[PDB]
Design an enzyme around this catalytic site. Structure first.
Site, short mmCIF file in Angstrom:
data_model
loop_
_atom_site.label_atom_id
_atom_site.label_comp_id
_atom_site.label_asym_id
_atom_site.label_seq_id
_atom_site.Cartn_x
_atom_site.Cartn_y
_atom_site.Cartn_z
N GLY A 168 3.27 1.85 -2.22
CA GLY A 168 4.59 1.34 -2.54
C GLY A 168 5.28 1.93 -3.75
O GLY A 168 6.39 1.52 -4.08
N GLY A 169 4.62 2.87 -4.43
CA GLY A 169 5.22 3.62 -5.54
C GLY A 169 5.28 2.81 -6.82
O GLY A 169 4.24 2.42 -7.37
N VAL A 171 0.89 -1.16 0.00
CA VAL A 171 0.00 0.00 0.00
C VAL A 171 0.92 1.20 0.00
O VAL A 171 1.76 1.33 0.89
CB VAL A 171 -0.92 0.06 1.25
CG1 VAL A 171 -1.84 1.28 1.20
CG2 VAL A 171 -1.75 -1.21 1.38
N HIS A 199 4.33 9.20 7.31
CA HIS A 199 4.95 10.50 7.60
C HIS A 199 4.56 11.60 6.59
O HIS A 199 4.75 12.78 6.88
CB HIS A 199 6.48 10.37 7.73
CG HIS A 199 7.22 10.40 6.43
ND1 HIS A 199 7.24 9.33 5.56
CD2 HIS A 199 7.98 11.36 5.87
CE1 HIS A 199 7.97 9.65 4.50
NE2 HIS A 199 8.43 10.87 4.67
N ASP A 200 4.00 11.22 5.44
CA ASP A 200 3.45 12.20 4.49
C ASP A 200 2.10 12.82 4.92
O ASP A 200 1.70 13.83 4.34
CB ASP A 200 3.33 11.57 3.08
CG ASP A 200 4.70 11.17 2.48
OD1 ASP A 200 5.75 11.69 2.92
OD2 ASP A 200 4.74 10.33 1.55
#
Lengths: 341, 339
Positions: free
Chosen positions: A178-179, A176, A246-247
């Protein structure tokens, strides 16, 4: 401390010319231009699109700091630092300090820190008109550059993740947020029995599909678009969150975690990998993490978190914090099971 | 054992959050709030304008860097470094890091460095609407703060300058762009016979008059408002230029030098005091000058110059370098005779 020692230290702490000198020079690509050797500034200026005098003074500061050499007066060459700032370099720092790229663009919010202290919320909107997420998507040139840089931090840590979690009781893993699936791919090829799913944005998952979705790990891997704030794709018994929380501010972080706990089900797991802040002092790289925190506060609404801040968000999504493991490279790895037995 | 890790060096150099955490916290008076001992964030937050969570996170960084102590979670106390950030302190750094003041205000230009490389000129106007001198003059309160900041600096250097030049040959000195007159005050009192003239802005010299015009040395000083690009007051035999040329581009700096030549006449003298750049550089002296020189590029249209860049300039104003000495603290003193 005392006086003169405190003075010298403060003078390091208060310097803003250097970090921007550095950022500018990287954006103009002076590191590339001196990779093969010493050049004089006339040539560096003329090649960069910069006024000779202006660039000379900038490079002289940066030479005094050890980013370039200055063997003879107006001639500048490469060092170990400059090599890290080349486009060539495998573990390059260009994309984090290239101002045409997305990441270094957000660093201009530093000058609005006082407003950030007044309102609490980020000041990327104040600096550029839109919040951070909107004008990434509003110009996908930056949106693809962002994914490229996040792909690089994934690579860095991917091995440590696959090593540090047990996968014995797992069938289908879901990266989830994961780019381009750098971490997923590493886990699947290291544990061949496992299946996988990459979840991220519409273009970014297709770009992940591109780079490895016909390879032997990519065969066992769903490439699914759509936002992690919506209901997640099914058949997962383990959701993987690597440097995603953290975003996001606490409300939005809670949503994602809720979606992960919903999707993995009663007997499942949610596997969280972040770099966690400690209760004062910390160890090495506590200074860097608190620096990062400030970027996350100013640019994004987000925040580097303590274990217990993570535990509160886990709890509010009906998960407990189980095993708390530390990788050699500083990542904390925590297994989240269902809150109640 | 060895500071050889290039990656660490680069991470050190690239930090943009620390210097603005620092400027903010000094702007908000936190070092002062903790002079008397530990305070916890909620109080510090209330007393300043700030959100508690944001201020916690900002102080956490600065504590990591040693500025403040944090002995229990969410409470921060003073240190040797915080003392230097107090208004309190004799050599305080507050006036250089207070974003309310114009000096640290100018540091916001850093983020427009690419344009400074395109054009060559300053980017204060792009940051703030007007270049540095225009909105300093358009906002008197900034003007005063600037003056106050420069006065502290001039105060520290003034004894070197008095002791650094030979005043035997000099009857009447004119401190051209001398701020509120801290160097002239010291120069006059060191040499009881001398007459003096401070030349700077009207509110600036007036502030000088109120500060020391009553003293014996003040009685020998003509406090004279005006612009050093206009014709200077007539008949001073020596013109002093203490850290004024570095603020100005080559063309403007030349105009000041000519104006100084005019007002002293032939066989008058122009006494310059700058920190000059040294080809082949070095450690903390050299790097600091290079940092300052970028501030001068981005805020003003100014430059730090070499002895010979300064000879080029003096030569084109009808002046020749007569004597070059160094003060025992690095300030190069140059006398120019009118050729």
């Amino acid at each position: 401390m005392a006086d003169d020692d405190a003075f010298v230290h403060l003078l390091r702490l208060k310097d803003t010319m250097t970090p921007w000198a550095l950022r500018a020079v990287v954006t103009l690509g002076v590191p590339d231009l001196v990779a093969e050797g010493e050049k004089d500034v006339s040539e560096l200026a003329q090649r960069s699109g910069a006024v000779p005098d202006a660039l000379r003074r900038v490079l002289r500061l940066l030479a005094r700091r050890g980013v370039f050499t200055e063997p003879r007066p107006a001639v500048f060459g490469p060092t170990g630092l400059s090599r890290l700032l080349q486009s060539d370099h495998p573990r390059s720092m260009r994309p984090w300090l290239d101002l045409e790229g997305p990441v270094a663009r957000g660093d201009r919010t530093c000058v609005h820190i006082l407003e950030a202290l007044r309102t609490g919320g980020p000041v990327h909107e104040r600096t550029y008109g839109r919040p951070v997420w909107e004008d990434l998507a509003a110009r996908p040139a930056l949106g693809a550059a962002f994914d490229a840089a996040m792909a690089q931090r994934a690579s860095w840590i991917a091995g440590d993740v696959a090593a540090g979690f047990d996968w014995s009781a797992v069938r289908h893993v879901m990266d989830v947020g994961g780019g381009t699936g750098g971490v997923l791919a590493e886990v699947l090829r290291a544990r061949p029995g496992l299946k996988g799913t990459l979840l991220d944005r519409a273009p970014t998952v297709a770009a992940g599909r591109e780079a490895w979705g016909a390879s032997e790990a990519g065969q066992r891997c769903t490439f699914s678009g759509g936002s992690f704030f919506d209901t997640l794709p099914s058949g997962a018994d383990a959701c993987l969150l690597v440097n995603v929380l953290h975003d996001w501010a606490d409300e939005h972080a809670l949503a994602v975690l809720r979606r992960c706990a919903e999707a993995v089900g009663p007997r499942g797991r949610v596997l969280i990998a972040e770099h966690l802040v400690e209760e004062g002092a910390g160890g090495p790289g506590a200074a860097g993490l608190a620096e990062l925190d400030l970027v996350m506060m100013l640019v994004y609404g987000g925040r580097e978190r303590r274990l217990d801040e993570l535990a509160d968000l886990a709890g509010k999504a009906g998960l407990r914090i189980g095993d708390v493991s530390m990788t050699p490279r500083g990542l904390s790895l925590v297994v989240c099971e269902a809150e109640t037995s």
